[PDB]
């Protein structure tokens, strides 16, 4: 009974997708298939710095008058960038649907990058990075990406190295903007109280101008020993299958089974036919090795012996979590934008439920043995990590005798 996500396509290739619902406020966003994976180490912070510059004024709406408009209807304006996708989204009321779309049009095209602003946003970005190091789990996941995807564009961070940040100019940005903002790589996603025909007419009216035009898992480890920190963060991952491979669903159930360290989180990060599947835990130094041992046993267990009931637990757990319908509009659309960018279609919740209920214990331990057993992991540690075991002990813990 969940309403279907209807997708149309303009000549530009900008797929305009929408999923109407009763809620009177909507989350209209633009997703773009452009991240740090498409950068070539000479423009490693171009997407991040453009994400900073995108709300500082356009040609038609110069400066803060633009954001005055998004204050005037009381709407909320957000943007984010990952290694593969960039999103500019607005939460607003339903009746303010046209102007919001027009605002989004300016943000993707006709944007203006002021040289004055460029220096101010450089100091913002530089400073944030200079303090970003504070967030350990971000440092550990960046280290894990770097040591797992050495020599590839997937190792480099979204923010880029301070070097590039300082060394960036309007023209470079202009390039990234004019290169990675093509209309066939763009989805206009709407969730909530929107009509699809009105949204399609608004996309035809504005946004109809947008121009129309592998990775290797290096199993290895990076350890940043700094003994003055109170807690240690350790992430261990193996290679993931990718977006389009259905056993992801089964792997998600495996994560739902795992769900000794103060904090233990499992992740299945997916990129275009690659990814990182693993666990991140933050612990006191004198516990670290025991955690690792614990964690490896669980994984090995699933690969070795997994019952029927726990599987059911994961199935159900995932089900409720996977549930996103009417979770929130922002989430809803976020899902429409990512589904049109990655799968090329919006997978409905009934298909997700079918793929969940076809998962049993035998295929779960088969897929877990395919992806976890006797695999070389990527290890990233930060903090008092002397008792964190080196690569032979972790690699030997990746199988059982």
């Amino acid at each position: 009974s969940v309403p279907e996500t209807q997708v149309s396509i303009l000549d530009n290739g900008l797929r305009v997708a929408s999923e109407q619902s009763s809620h009177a406020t909507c989350t209209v966003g633009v997703w773009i298939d452009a991240g740090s994976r498409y950068e070539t180490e000479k423009n490693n912070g171009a997407g991040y710095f453009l994400e900073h510059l995108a709300f500082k004024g356009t040609k038609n709406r110069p400066g803060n008058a633009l954001e005055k408009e998004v204050e005037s209807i009381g709407a909320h304006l957000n943007a984010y960038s990952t290694r593969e996708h960039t999103a500019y989204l607005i939460k607003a009321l339903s009746k303010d649907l046209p102007k919001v779309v027009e605002l989004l049009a300016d943000i993707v095209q006709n944007s203006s990058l002021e040289d004055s602003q460029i220096e101010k946003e450089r100091d913002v970005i530089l400073r944030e990075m200079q303090e970003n190091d504070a967030s350990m789990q971000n440092v550990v996941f960046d280290y894990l990406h770097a040591t797992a995807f050495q020599g590839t564009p997937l190792a480099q961070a979204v923010e880029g190295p301070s070097e590039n940040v300082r060394r960036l100019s309007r023209t470079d940005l202009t390039d990234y903007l004019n290169r990675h903002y093509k209309a066939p790589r763009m989805v206009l996603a709407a969730a909530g109280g929107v009509e699809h025909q009105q949204l399609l007419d608004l996309a035809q009216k504005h946004l109809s101008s947008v121009s129309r035009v592998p990775c290797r898992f290096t199993g290895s480890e990076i350890r940043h020993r700094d003994d003055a920190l109170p807690l240690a963060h350790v992430a261990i991952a193996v290679e993931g299958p990718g977006w389009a491979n259905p056993d992801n669903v089964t792997l998600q159930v495996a994560n739902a089974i795992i769900g000794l360290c103060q904090s233990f989180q499992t992740f299945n990060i997916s990129y275009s036919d690659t990814g990182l599947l693993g666990a991140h835990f933050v612990c006191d130094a004198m516990s670290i090795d025991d955690m690792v041992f614990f964690l490896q046993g669980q994984w090995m267990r699933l690969c070795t012996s997994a019952t029927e009931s726990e599987v059911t637990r994961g199935k159900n757990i995932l089900r409720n979590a996977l549930v996103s319908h009417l979770d929130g509009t922002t989430p809803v659309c976020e899902d429409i934008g990512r589904s049109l960018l990655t799968y090329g279609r919006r997978i409905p919740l009934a298909e997700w439920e079918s793929r969940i209920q076809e998962v049993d214990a035998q295929m779960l331990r088969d897929i877990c043995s395919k992806y976890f057993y006797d695999q070389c992991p990527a290890v990233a540690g930060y903090g008092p990590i002397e008792q964190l075991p080196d690569y032979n002990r972790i690699r030997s813990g990746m199988f059982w005798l």
Binding site: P389, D390, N392, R393, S396
Partner: protein, 189 residues
């Protein structure tokens, strides 16, 4: 006693060839120094067997294949190779007692060794003069091993007497003085 030897060591951990505090760089033993000990065991087994199965009588003595005759005495008598350095020293000292004592000291001088360390650096990796003195010590230890074999006659005796004098003077006198000189060269003393 070897179990006590291992205990008195783990309290302090093993040393490294640079002689520095290796606390910043330590690794496990199971996968790193176990396969290394297994390889060393394999090489030592290669040398032993090839010293049993091909050259079985190389290190022994032929006169041990005769039965023990109290009425006769093997004309050329010598301790096995390992006990020779001591044998030389014993023979060198004219006085019987002196020989016995020196002999004992030969082994005991080692125990005395931790009180003779006068350098601010633990290892000899960065100490070339004491390296030269160490290899001269290994050299005249080999000389004393050879002399023991040689019979009592000129000039084997004099070498033995000198070699023993040089051995005790290098261990007792020359190495701490050299360590003081080496500390003076680095502007430490």
């Amino acid at each position: 006693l070897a179990i006590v030897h291992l205990l008195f060591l783990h309290e302090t951990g093993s040393n490294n060839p640079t002689g520095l505090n290796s606390d910043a760089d330590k690794i496990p033993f199971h996968p790193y120094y176990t396969i290394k000990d297994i390889l060393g065991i394999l090489i030592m087994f290669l040398i032993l067997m090839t010293l049993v199965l091909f050259f079985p009588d190389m290190l022994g003595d032929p006169d041990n294949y005769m039965p023990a005759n109290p009425l006769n005495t093997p004309p050329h008598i010598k301790p096995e190779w390992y006990f020779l350095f001591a044998y030389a020293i014993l023979r060198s000292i004219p006085n019987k007692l002196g020989g016995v004592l020196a002999l004992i000291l030969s082994i005991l001088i080692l125990a005395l060794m931790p009180f003779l360390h006068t350098s601010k650096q633990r290892s000899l990796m960065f100490r070339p003069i004491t390296q030269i003195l160490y290899w001269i010590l290994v050299a005249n230890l080999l000389i004393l091993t050879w002399i023991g074999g040689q019979p009592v006659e000129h000039p084997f005796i004099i070498i033995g007497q000198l070699a023993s004098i040089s051995y005790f003077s290098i261990i007792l006198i020359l190495m701490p003085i050299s360590g003081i000189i080496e500390d003076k060269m680095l502007k430490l003393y």
